[PDB]
Design an enzyme around this catalytic site. Sequence first.
Site, PDB file in Angstrom:
ATOM      1  N   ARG A 172      -7.580 -47.357   9.594  1.00 30.99           N
ATOM      2  CA  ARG A 172      -6.774 -46.490   8.737  1.00 30.99           C
ATOM      3  C   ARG A 172      -7.604 -46.085   7.521  1.00 30.99           C
ATOM      4  O   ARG A 172      -8.283 -46.918   6.918  1.00 30.99           O
ATOM      5  CB  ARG A 172      -5.489 -47.205   8.298  1.00 30.99           C
ATOM      6  N   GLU A 187      -6.427 -37.537   4.603  1.00 25.78           N
ATOM      7  CA  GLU A 187      -6.653 -37.165   5.991  1.00 25.78           C
ATOM      8  C   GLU A 187      -5.697 -36.019   6.304  1.00 25.78           C
ATOM      9  O   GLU A 187      -4.495 -36.138   6.097  1.00 25.78           O
ATOM     10  CB  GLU A 187      -6.361 -38.348   6.922  1.00 25.78           C
ATOM     11  N   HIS A 223     -10.207 -38.342  13.562  1.00 28.47           N
ATOM     12  CA  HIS A 223      -9.281 -39.356  14.065  1.00 28.47           C
ATOM     13  C   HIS A 223      -9.027 -39.234  15.571  1.00 28.47           C
ATOM     14  O   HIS A 223      -7.885 -39.106  16.017  1.00 28.47           O
ATOM     15  CB  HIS A 223      -7.964 -39.268  13.277  1.00 28.47           C
TER      16      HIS A 223
END
Lengths: 311, 311
Positions: B230, B258, B277
């Site tokens: 994360r 993000e 990601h």
Amino acid sequence: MRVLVTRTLPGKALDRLRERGLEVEVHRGLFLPKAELLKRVEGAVGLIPTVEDRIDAEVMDRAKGLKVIACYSVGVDHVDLEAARERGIRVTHTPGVLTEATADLTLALLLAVARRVVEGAAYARDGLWKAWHPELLLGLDLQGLTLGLVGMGRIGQAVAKRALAFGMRVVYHARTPKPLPYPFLSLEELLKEADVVSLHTPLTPETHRLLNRERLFAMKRGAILLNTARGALVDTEALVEALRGHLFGAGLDVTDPEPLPPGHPLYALPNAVITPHIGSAGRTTRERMAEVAVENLLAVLEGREPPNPVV
Amino acid sequence: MRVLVTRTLPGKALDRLRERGLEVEVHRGLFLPKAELLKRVEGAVGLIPTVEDRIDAEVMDRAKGLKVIACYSVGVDHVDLEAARERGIRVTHTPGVLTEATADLTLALLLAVARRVVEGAAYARDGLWKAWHPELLLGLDLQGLTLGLVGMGRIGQAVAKRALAFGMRVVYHARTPKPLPYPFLSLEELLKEADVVSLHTPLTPETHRLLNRERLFAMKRGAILLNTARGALVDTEALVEALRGHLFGAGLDVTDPEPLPPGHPLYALPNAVITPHIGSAGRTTRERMAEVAVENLLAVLEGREPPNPVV
């Protein structure tokens, strides 16, 4: 006694030569015209060339008094071995040293292509990344897939070991079978059953463009081709053809021609990852290569038998 | 009975729900504003969200009848677990199915950074590749290096297995020791001796900014940081400072914020490789996560215990 090193080297392995009273001439820059090599080589007792230097009879004759050619590489196709033999010049290389490094980058290319890492990095860099999504940049899961190695020397074996850890199955083809726990197949069956084909065989008249148009399209649709060995093992133009829709992609560290010109179509294909022949570009590996070349050279100059002679 | 799937999913796992007579609404596109989510979740009995959808008390109360939140992901920091529990709403996720894919991407990033693959591809693409040279694009050889995993669940263990094949040593830190053949260390000890630090721990108030400025500079000069867990686990701004002259590099599949805007300083650091990601972006993996999310949702609607509950 003067020693000529055709290119600057990483690390201080050369200091050993200097410590021994030897005069070390190290050529700076990316290029070394044969004309300048001939000028620098005359009078030298030792020489440490690279794959980019053509060490033929002329260079040897020009170097009246050359005792050893300690190659800064494992391959020696750029050195007329018989010419050196006929002149009583010893020739050595650096075997073993770049195996792990080359295997590492082979794997890096497989993952780069399979999981679209280079493509993904560009996607983020160019500002196209807006959010996470279930169907964004989907690649190939490696688990259960078959890696087919063409040539099973030390590098091929190192690659196979890594592959097994990612859950891949391994098969191989080589001029001669080996006592390994992997199925030995003909080139034809390997191309047919492999999900990923990786080349690790030396270049010879028999392997020149082994991966031609017929063999590339014989690979399964959705397959990946990897080549960190020799550019000429692959028919470059045919690879471009196969990448448009047949092959999932290709990861190349070596090309034909090499370097591969900027405007070449392979660079315009997102499923192609081309690295500039950096397979052995590990800092420790390159410094180690220097130590081994230095050892071999000093050995011959001290009237001793070098550890890694070619001739 | 209507089930809302917040994003389109690869594969046909959703047909199972349709065959059962459930009405399935699947949102198309890269965005789903909260105001839009609220509007569509009302009256839904089941919800399959992504990490992009913040499922809080407001969303739950708007549904008025929601029985299960079947996460299409392993991490659940985007869902208010306690709000769901107090409302009797079940929450599930998709562990295991994405383990191998995430481990693969983690290794891909390590190799990409360590061997400067993305940078090398750019070098060739931009036309700077003119010759092979002993000191061109030198990277880090992984053999003999120590990989320190902070968090040792399924993914961390999968990563360790792969690292071992590359000749790396593995050490780890976790809440408590585990029955594993690797040295167990405190976070402090791990940061000090690891050459590569990889995060594999869930995001919680305690792990928020775990890798802060102090810890980033506590890592070895020349170390590599990997983050596929994360983004909020790392102080992104401090990471930039550390990458300019302390750390060898960083491979990030997640960031904070993000997505990371294209003008962010990290994109200008060649020793940083950022992917959007895509850790679990293996096609088979994403289709499998869909099947798992579906099984969990169906189980709860059928009055039976789901296989991967969180709440």
